[PDB]
Amino acid sequence: TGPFSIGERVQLTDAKGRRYTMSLTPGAEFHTHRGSIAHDAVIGLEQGSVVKSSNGALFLVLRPLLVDYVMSMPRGPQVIYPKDAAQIVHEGDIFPGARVLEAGAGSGALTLSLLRAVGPAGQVISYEQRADHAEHARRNVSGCYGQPPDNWRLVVSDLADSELPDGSVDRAVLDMLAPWEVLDAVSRLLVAGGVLMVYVATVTQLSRIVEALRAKQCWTEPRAWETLQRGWNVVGLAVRPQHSMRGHTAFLVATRRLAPGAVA
Ligand SMILES: C[S@@+](CC[C@H](N)C(=O)[O-])C[C@H]1O[C@@H](n2cnc3c(N)ncnc32)[C@H](O)[C@@H]1O
């Protein structure tokens, strides 16, 4: 992508790690607590450059990675965390060209990883039953690209009421309070062999969705797990895990769709 251009998102990091994000606009002045930075001074610079404020405070300038962008969007429905989005893409096998169904669009954080994984030849169909939440996702997804992707369909309705054709999606991902309520729709929509990933914060949700999947009888035995992420301090002889860590985000569940009338 080269040097910074107009319209681009830029991440600024001051001398003690606070991150600031802006959209480059000629003539605009970016304001922080360590001074102000002119957008005109950043437009044209190479990534990884250090700019100086109006008060001399030094700032590192970089293009945000998708994970940086997703974690700094406006307040709204809780975004999925990076370790979980990574495994949804990977264990959910979101392949190039896939047709993916998603429900809860929420803030669109997972949506952006799903769109990146399927690429221009694939498609993402996201349901968001709340109109207000949907506007957040729509705004966040467009803000990553500069415009609405043409391979993204956002449907403002309950997924349970979906009218899409049978077997029209290759992969499905659910992040909502009550995923068992949309399982009949998912079972109809997802093709044979298709992968379903479910993200649930509590063990009561976890048990209920795994048992609902088994009761529907058209799914492989569900696989359920959690991941814990722990940062490390690696400074001279002081090499040790960090003292604070996030204890939990949510559990993951993976299952695959059986063929019409198959058992095992
Ligand atoms: C936890 S948020 C999803 C966050 C999303 N994974 C992201 O990273 O931003 C759950 C979303 O699912 C939505 N929702 C819940 N049940 C739904 C249903 N049956 N159909 C469609 N949307 C639903 C909620 O309105 C909420 O916006």
From Swiss-Prot:
Q: Which GO terms describe its cellular component?
A: tRNA (m1A) methyltransferase complex
Q: Which Gene3D superfamilies match?
A: 3.10.330.20, Vaccinia Virus protein VP39
Q: Where does the source fall among the domains of life? A: Bacteria
> Which segments cross the bilayer?
none
EC number(s) per entry: 2.1.1.220
**What general EC class does the enzyme of this chain belong to?**
transferase
User: What catalytic reaction does the record list?
Assistant: adenosine(58) in tRNA + S-adenosyl-L-methionine = N(1)-methyladenosine(58) in tRNA + S-adenosyl-L-homocysteine + H(+)
UniProt GO molecular function: tRNA (adenine(58)-N1)-methyltransferase activity
User: What keywords appear on the UniProt entry?
Assistant: Methyltransferase, S-adenosyl-L-methionine, Transferase, tRNA processing
Fetch the Pfam families from UniProt.
Answer: GCD14, TrmI-like_N
Q: What does this protein do?
A: Catalyzes the S-adenosyl-L-methionine-dependent formation of N(1)-methyladenine at position 58 (m1A58) in tRNA.
Assembly notes: Homotetramer composed of a dimer of dimers.
Sequence similarity: Belongs to the class I-like SAM-binding methyltransferase superfamily. TRM61 family.
What name does UniProt use for this protein?
Answer: tRNA (adenine(58)-N(1))-methyltransferase TrmI
* Organism encoding this protein: Mycobacterium tuberculosis (strain CDC 1551 / Oshkosh)
Q: What is the lineage of its organism?
A: Bacteria, Bacillati, Actinomycetota, Actinomycetes, Mycobacteriales
